[PDB]
Copies of this chain bind each other. A is one copy, B any other.
Amino acid sequence: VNENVNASRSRIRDTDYARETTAMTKAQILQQASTSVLAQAKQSPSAALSLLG
């Protein structure tokens, strides 16, 4: 019973490194994707003053 409950708690409490590592990597690529567009986003007012100002 001790083994069986140990494996049962693993399936609901322990983390899956196969999925969690992929989940973090999807977020890290998500970071640099959002930071890069953010870098290109604040140049919208840069087009404003370069227009005539």
Which residues of A does B touch, CB under 8 Å? 17-18, 21-22, 24, 48, 51-52
Contact = CB atoms under 8 A, between A and B. Distances in A.
9 contacts: A17-B48, A17-B51, A17-B52, A18-B48, A18-B51, A21-B51, A21-B52, A22-B51, A24-B52
A51 B48 CA distance: 47
A1 B52 CA distance: 33
Contacts of A51: 17-18, 21-22
A22 B48 CA distance: 12
A8 B22 CA distance: 38
Given A17-B51, A18-B48, A21-B52, 6 more contacts: A17-B48, A17-B52, A18-B51, A21-B51, A22-B51, A24-B52
